[PDB]
Each structure stands twice: as structure tokens, then as C-alpha cells.
């Protein structure tokens, strides 16, 4: 073990676009509160603040609304690519292939090109991943377009096949605000690593997604919904979860590396998965996940993170739960993004060294002396 | 100090580089590329059995599943070919994905046997009109490689160039390709993920791409009297030279005396009477004038070259070669990991209130 390990509070670079876990608001996108904005703007105007600096009047915001509307539909040659995706494959390797092959199609010739670029993503995100979905798990070709004018909504339309309610397009907004951006972790790392050899914007983003696939960064919300998921009863969860912490299991969802008292996330999340748990009958799930989140609290004194009831809300909506996941990649391609325009722009990072813990040098031996 | 390696030294007394303790210098000498991809996947040099037996699986991994080959078709000829390495990589993972752990040498094998094929498949059908047989009689991973672009059973010179090239790119530490495959272990991503990140770290042009323009400095000219008078002239407007120099390595690089050698072998072989003379003009000069050695990339653009390679598959070529220390790099990751995540210093604005649509 290395004292430099994970490269734990060593700088690796600067950034306007978000701070977490200072005093005052928990966590702030370019200064504002990530609250304030989940309550009262639809993840466009998010998108447009990390991206081109400030939130938008309604006339900028009518322009960017009517730009992503005309980026949902997929090229041809990417449609005939996912249908040869396995109906098996991990979802995210799904996002990845998506992004790496638009790569090739729609190519970054310039760095001038970088904004279209992330507004493409984000505007084809919900069709690559639903697109090979509904055709490996329904055998549809879909349309790539919807009436729905945002995202949130939008995505939600091409998994179900129809409007959905004016409560889900609102708990996808709010969602995809909430995961937009988070500062210096793996997968936006990896982003700016790659984005300091000056390559393009769909390298960064593939290999970003790759560092999202791993267990110890993405996953969580899904890992969360494959525990509440096991009780028919919140009693049952409770008397459970004591056996659990008993054998010291490690509880996904609560806790936080950076978070203090609380991650401001959970507490809006939290209230917009009991309204849709009211709204489509739910007597179970919330309950459990309530009763989870308290007994967690009794026996361990830990908060539930963001993560936890994101995997009641989506599950309220329909999604399935290997989807999770490639939604946060629709909202955080927004930060990612914005994070390789930074380091495009000041184009400072570490550079770490390794130390050699190998043999010493030794004498070549030919193959039959072997 | 990001984490430990035993695979690699740079700059170090002695041999400059090494491989688990050997001399590159020796490796690429005597050794096939599959020696040394064993030696740094499983940790030992070889025996014969080993060998045989190493040699026989990775012949039986060189074909692409027809569910890739309908891929690479639909990517078009003018992609960026590190583009359609980083998609075959990704694509390969939907299809055979390394479900445990104790897959991951088996699935670093299949894409060391698999690269040539996604390279050349993809190229011939895109530039030549050919749907190509992805399987060669080539024993070696260079030579099929070669087999596979030409569609001829390459000299046995090139087969020799080819397994000297990939053993003197296949590893070299900490830089920023090894480190993005490091950064996506570390979050204990599956190994598809850590190479197609690694791919695209190396398609940025500050990192990847050196001997594509060292080569694109060399075929400027037209004898060694025009490149000697041009190259004082760009010496003169400190011009950076491509191919010249190095962050650690002192007085030479190791890999240059190996791969320079080679060139000049093939240079006679196919009749060059310029390429060659050229580039050792500009060597000499920039050590008189400067004393800055070559690197590994400058004689390689030329030994490419003579072997009929077309610049802009160089890149891919070493991807061929370094996928051997990435995959490694990410076992030694696994094996020691913690998530890496570091800090940022904070430049933006403070804190400050929501403003309403309508009064933006
Ligand atoms: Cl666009």
C-alpha cells in the first residue's frame, strides 16, 4: 500500500463547474445550488449551464430545445450496428459501442465542433440505449423521435412506447439534474485524462463510460434496487438488513466518501419517489425502502446517499433495472463533456510516476535453455 | 506515485529498458512477440512446451465473429483507424465479454490474436472491396499480421521486422494510455472497457501518432543533401524535430538502436536508394548540431514503410503491440487497486442565488 494511493486529495487539475461538499450548499453547479435547480429548471437548462456557462433566458432555451429535438434520430449505419449487439450484452457496453461507432459516422474534425458534438450525445443518448433495447428484448425497430420536447420525457417515450405522465418527464428531469455533474471522480477523470492528449470528444466519452461500468463507481442505484426488491413487507426488510449488518455486508446506497452530514441529492429524490409512489399505487417498495433507510440510520448512524432512492423512483417509472445505469450516462455525458472543454481549454493535469517493485535486472535465457 | 509496477523500468542504470528484469535490447533480438506477451501476461519467459502451446491457442483466436465483421463494414473508409480499433475492442466485449476475473488473460489473449484481424478486415474491405479470411498459415502474430493486410505470405525479413517491432512497443510504464487503462481498473471495470479507454488516450496526437509524422518529416525529401540542408534550416527556427528526443531516456534510446538496424535491413531488401539515406542524414545532423538521439519512432516510420504499411495504420499497429503491457498493467491493478479518484482546485464563481427564467 502506497501513501499516494488513488491519488486521494492530490490536484489534478482546475474546475469552475462544480464544488462538493463545501460549506453552504452541499453541491453547487457553477455557484447554484443543486437543489434550487433540480426543483425548478428541466435538465436542459442544466445541460446548457455546464456547456456554454449560464443559465438561459427563454428565447436561448427555446433554440437549444428545438437544436436537441432535431439530434434524436440515429444514422442508418448505427441502427444496423445495435441490432447486431446481443440481447445479453451489458447495457453499458451497449452506451459505449454507441458512442465509439457515432464516432466514426459524425466525426470531431475540429475542437470548434465540440459543443455540437456533446449536444449530439446528449440528444442521441436515449435512442441508442432504448433503440437496442426494445429491439433485442421486444424484437421493434423504433422510432428515435417522440413528441416529448425534453430529454427526460423523451427517453421515457421511447421505452414505453407512449406519452408518459407529467410526474415521470418531471422525476427524469429532476433526475438527470441530479447526476449531471459531480467534480473529480473516476469516470470524469478518465474523461480529462484522455482529453489532455488532445484527443476527440468521443474518445473521452467512451472511456468514460468504461470507468462508469465498474462496481466501484456505477451501479449502485441498481445494486439498490436488487436489495429492496427481496421484501414483500418493510418488516421483513428491517429484520433482515439487522442480519445483514450483523455478517458486516456492505450496504449500497448510504454512506459517502466526500458528504458529511447528508448528500443533498437524497432529500429530493426521496420526496419525488413518494409522490410517484402515490401516484401509481405503491403500498410496498417505498415502504421498504423507508424502513431500510431508518434501520441503517439506527444501527450504523449512515444517510442514504443519492443512489438509494433513485432505484425506487425508476422502478415507479418502468425502467428496467439494467438501465439504470445508462440513464446516469444521458445526464452526466453533460458534466463529462464540459469537463474535456475545460481541459481542452487549460490544458494542466498530474502526471503520475510509478514505483518499480519488479526483479532485478537479469541475463536473457534462449528458448531451449528454457 | 500512483501505484506499483513490476512489468517495466525506464532510464534506469544499465539496461534502459526492461521487461520483468530483461533487456529489451535481447528480447527483440531473440525472441518472438509471443514470448514477451507471455512473459508479461503470465509473468516468466516460456519454455518450448509453453511456447507451442501458446503459439496453438492464440492461432485459434485470430478469427472475428460475424456479428464484428457486419460492424467493421458498416464503419466507413475514412474513419480515423484508431477509431475502428477503439469500436472492435467494444464491440468484442458485447460478444465475449470476460464475465469473471478469472478470465482476464484469456480475454487479453483473444484481443492480442484478434487485433491484426479487426485492422486489416476492416481496411481491405473499406480501401480494396475484399471481404478477407481472417485466419493466415503465418505462425507468428507479426506475420500475420502481414499476411492478413497484403493478402500474400510476407519474407521472412518482415516477418522478423514485424515481431522485433511489437516486442519494442509492447510496454514502457506510466503514460497517459497505460494510466487511463490504470484509472478504469481501478473502478474494477471489465478489460474491454480498460483497453478501449486506453485506445482512444492514445488517438490524442500528444500521445499517440509519433512515427506516422516522423514519417510524414522523412518523405519530404528527395535525397539526404535536400533533408540535411531543410532540417538546418528548421534547426534554425526551432522547429521541434518528430522522432527526436525524450521526457527520461538520457543518452539513447534502446529501442532506436534495434528497430534502426532493421530498417536498414529492409531498406536493402526492397531497393530503396532514398528513405533510408534520409533518415540517417537527419540523424547525424540532429546529433551533430544538437545532440539529440532518435526515439523508437523515427527509424520505425521507415521500416514500416518498406514493409508496404500505409502510415495511417501505423497507430494501430502499436495498439497491437502495447495491448500486451495494458492488459497487464490492469492485472497489476486488480491485484492492488484502489479506486482512483483525485482532487481539483476550485475556480469558479461563489455560491450564489437562482435566478427565475424570466429574469435571465
Ligand atoms: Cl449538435
Redesign the interface.
Known sequence: ???????????????????VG?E??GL?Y????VR??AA?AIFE?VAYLLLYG?????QQ?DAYLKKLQGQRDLPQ?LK??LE???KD??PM??M??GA??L???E?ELSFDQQRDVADRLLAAFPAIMTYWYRFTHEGQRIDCNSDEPTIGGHFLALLHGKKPSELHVKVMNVSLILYAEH?????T??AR????????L???V??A??????????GANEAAMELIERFSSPQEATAELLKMLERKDKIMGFGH?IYKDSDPRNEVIKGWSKQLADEVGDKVLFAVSEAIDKTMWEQKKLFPNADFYHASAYHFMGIPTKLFTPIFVCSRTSGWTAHVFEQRANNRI?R?????????????????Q?
Not at 449560464?54 to 427563454?58: A, D, I, M, S, Y
Not at 485524462?193 to 476527440?200: E, Q
Not at 463510460?209 to 456505477?218: A, D, E, F, T
Not at 503520475?352 to 531451449?368: K, W
Open positions: 500500500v502506497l501513501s499516494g494511493a488513488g491519488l486521494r486529495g492530490q490536484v489534478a487539475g482546475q474546475t469552475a463547474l462544480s464544488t463545501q453552504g450548499a453547487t457553477r455557484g447554484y445550488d434550487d435547480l425548478a437548462e449560464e443559465l438561459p433566458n427563454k432555451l449505419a444496423e450496428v447486431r449487439i446481443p450484452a451489458h457496453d451497449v459505449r459501442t465509439s461507432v464516432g466514426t459516422l466525426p467534480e473529480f471522480n473516476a469516470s477523470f478518465t485524462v484522455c482529453a489532455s492528449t488532445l484527443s476527440d468521443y474518445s473521452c467512451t472511456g463510460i468504461g470507468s462508469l461500468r465498474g462496481p466501484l463507481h456505477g466518501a498530474i503520475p510516476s510509478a514505483e518499480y517493485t519488479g526483479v532485478e535486472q537479469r541475463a536473457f535465457v534462449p528458448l531451449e528454457r
